[PDB]
């Protein structure tokens, strides 16, 4: 009968330690707050969003303030090809003389980090040149974070609290965001490219002190109204042009060169601007157009579960398109920085997609009404529900037996001294597509390997001018634009498919079995996350919808891991110009053990040793740190509540019976973590361990050999 926790009234009467844990676990779980109403819920969400908004801005301000103060951007802009970007200083009192001596690196005198987020390459392209331009963004974001905070506070006050109808006006939000949020922002970013970014890449300084005076083009805005848009197709930059300075600089602000800049190996600024200007137009027009709509509007989980499903899709795209299409100068050449950005965003994509299906299952338990959803599209998947899972179950089984089978087949015959007996399947359907995209390496000789096809010529309106720049790049093996593939790429791609199929099955089944099955017809009555249904009826562990999300988090990490494992190993050879090592060893699993894990861990594992230490001791310590916390998760997942609760009782007895200690007492009675709690806590250790093992290895292995 204590005041804490406020949001959960029932928890507040629990006299044990469970109260504190669950009071944290049910705090921001607003849908089960005591005495809550729908109108208060929506107004609270809006304000909560501002807090997140402020944090992202502060984070980027923290990404700005520390670089301007302790980084080396001004030093970096001068010759990016050898300077290591500095994240921030190292102020750790436990450091010794020899640890300061090792991390005083990147040409610094005090210890600092070597940054790998790529913000230096991104900010350069955007037009930032000096540390003081950095200092402006952090200060500006500080106000914007406080302005979002004030606004969140503002829209919670009586006179400014919105009504319910405003929050549920779905069509207007899409219209206003593709109008505003998408339309106006993309068009303006083309403007920031042409009014700021492009001049600075051509040696011309444009700042607040002069931006109103210097125009982006010699005689612009007289052709603009008269329809003579073609004047902006004036003289681009020559192949001899040196990025960031005026030796070879042109005057174009809108182009369609295609390919990559020969020096930077990244997109043309003028090319990025036209793309954003064009997409902007598309969203502004579509944003002026406005039974399932009555269902997607009343469930906050359905909207979010699609919003993560949209976020999860485009997060994967960001990883796929940034490694093959580098958009920032020299970002293709900073290989560790190429490695961190791909892995990071791919893991995020896995969480959102898994999360999308997780919140979908919550919708099915608390909001899906069988009688307001009848004879529509939603309830017709529930109709043949047993069919979808059963077929999906088969494909996973099918994929697994054969994909593992081919790898083991190759391994054995290779183990016996006979590599020629391996089963190596050429990715001919894939090799078709690159050849259809213009890659004349595989020689399939149709569709822009065909020099006369109507696609390459485009006899309609003489449009196709991305083609020269593109064809040069697709045949040169100096980038990652449609990388060469062989037997290794075939097997992994089917493994990834196997990973995508097994991960999707559990998440779809979890949502589809959330409301009920034969083993548990009334599952919906117990809510989303509950322990089980006892040892009766054969046993019911891991029967809750939450547990399905929980098991799937193990499968996604494996899937997203295999993708990042594949992407990493392949890139090692290309960056070291010896693609042959990977091509022959990646078709059997011992190669991934000998030439990928063991081989690339040589330096990382020697970050410190009995003879000294180097600048990789953190990564070496973190690697071991990750292994420990990964393994710590196994403890909570294998040993369950009962064992611990009985163990705790002997400690409670011992404390109360020990003089000089008996005198003091706990306020909350000690109890073991809950059944669901342990799964989450175990998985959290496991997953953090999964990443911080991979983060330590990925960064350290590449930073030592380049």
């Amino acid at each position: 009968g204590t005041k804490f926790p406020k949001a959960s009234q029932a928890l507040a009467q629990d006299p044990t330690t469970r109260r504190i844990w669950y009071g944290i676990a049910t705090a921001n779980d607003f849908e089960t707050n005591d005495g809550i109403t729908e109108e208060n819920l929506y107004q609270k969400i809006f304000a909560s969003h501002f807090g997140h908004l402020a944090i992202i801005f502060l984070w980027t301000s923290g990404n700005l303030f520390h670089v301007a103060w302790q980084g080396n951007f001004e030093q970096w802009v001068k010759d990016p090809l050898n300077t290591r970007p500095i994240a921030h200083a190292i102020s750790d009192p436990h450091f010794g003389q020899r640890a300061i001596e090792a991390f005083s690196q990147a040409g610094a005198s005090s210890p600092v980090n070597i940054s790998y987020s790529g913000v230096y390459q991104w900010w350069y392209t955007q037009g930032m040149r000096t540390n003081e331009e950095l200092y402006n963004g952090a200060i500006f974001l500080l106000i914007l974070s406080a302005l979002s905070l004030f606004a969140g506070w503002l829209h919670l006050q009586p006179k400014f609290r919105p009504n319910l109808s405003w929050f549920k006006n779905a069509e207007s939000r899409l219209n206003h965001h593709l109008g505003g949020l998408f339309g106006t922002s993309s068009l303006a970013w083309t403007g920031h490219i042409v009014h700021v970014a492009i001049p600075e890449s051509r040696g011309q300084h444009v700042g607040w002190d002069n931006f109103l005076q210097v125009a982006p083009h010699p005689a612009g805005l007289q052709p603009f109204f008269t329809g003579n848009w073609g004047v902006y197709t004036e003289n681009p930059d020559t192949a001899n042009h040196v990025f960031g300075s005026s030796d070879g600089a042109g005057t174009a602000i809108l182009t369609f060169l295609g390919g990559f800049h020969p020096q930077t190996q990244s997109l043309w600024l003028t090319d990025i601007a036209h793309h954003h200007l064009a997409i902007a137009v598309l969203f502004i027009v579509a944003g002026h157009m406005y039974g399932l709509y009555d269902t997607v509007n009343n469930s906050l989980h359905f909207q979010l579960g699609l919003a993560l499903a949209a976020l999860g899709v485009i997060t994967s795209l960001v990883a796929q398109h940034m490694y093959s299409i580098p958009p920032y100068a020299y970002l293709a050449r900073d290989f560790t920085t190429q490695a961190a950005l791909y892995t990071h965003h791919q893991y995020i994509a896995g969480f959102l997609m898994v999360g999308a299906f997780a919140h979908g299952a919550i919708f099915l338990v608390r909001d899906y009404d069988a009688e307001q959803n009848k004879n529509n599209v939603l309830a017709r998947i529930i109709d043949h529900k047993e069919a979808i899972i059963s077929h999906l179950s088969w494909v996973s089984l099918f994929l697994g037996f054969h994909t593992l089978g081919l790898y083991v087949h190759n391994d054995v015959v290779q183990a016996f001294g006979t590599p020629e007996k391996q089963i190596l399947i050429e990715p001919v359907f894939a090799q078709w597509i690159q050849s259809v995209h213009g890659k004349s390496l595989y020689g399939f000789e149709v569709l822009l390997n065909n020099a006369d096809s109507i696609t390459r010529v485009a006899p309609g309106s003489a449009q196709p001018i991305w083609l020269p720049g593109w064809l040069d790049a697709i045949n040169s093996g100096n980038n990652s634009l449609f990388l060469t593939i062989g037997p290794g790429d075939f097997l992994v791609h089917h493994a990834i498919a196997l990973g995508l199929h097994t991960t999707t099955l559990i998440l779809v089944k979890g949502a589809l079995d959330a409301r009920g099955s034969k083993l548990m017809p009334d599952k919906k009555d117990f809510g989303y996350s509950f322990p089980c249904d006892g040892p009766g009826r054969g046993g019911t562990c891991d029967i809750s919808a939450w547990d399905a999300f929980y098991l799937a988090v193990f499968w996604m990490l494996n899937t997203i891991g295999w993708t990042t494992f594949y992407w990493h190993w392949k890139h090692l050879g290309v960056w070291q110009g010896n693609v042959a090592q990977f091509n022959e060893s990646s078709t059997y699993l011992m190669g991934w053990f000998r030439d990928y894990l063991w081989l690339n861990s040589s330096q990382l594992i020697n970050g410190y040793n009995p003879f000294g230490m180097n600048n990789l001791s953190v990564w070496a310590w973190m690697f071991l740190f990750g292994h420990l916390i990964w393994a710590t998760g196994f403890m909570f997942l294998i040993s369950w509540r009962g064992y611990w609760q009985e163990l705790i009782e002997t400690l409670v007895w011992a404390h109360e019976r020990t003089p000089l200690a008996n005198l003091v007492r706990w306020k909350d009675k000690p109890v073991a973590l809950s059944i669901v709690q342990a799964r989450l806590v175990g998985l959290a250790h496991f997953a953090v361990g999964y990443i911080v093992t991979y983060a330590a290895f990925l960064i350290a292995s590449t930073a030592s050999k380049f």
Binding site: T2, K3, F4, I20, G23, S91, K667, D668
Partner: peptide, 30 residues
Amino acid sequence: NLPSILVPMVGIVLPAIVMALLFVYIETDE
């Protein structure tokens, strides 16, 4: 002269108070 004071305030001094405030908030009642 700036981080040498600041990091043992945020890492040491700050959790000594914000867990002290969040000890008297978890274990008090109405």
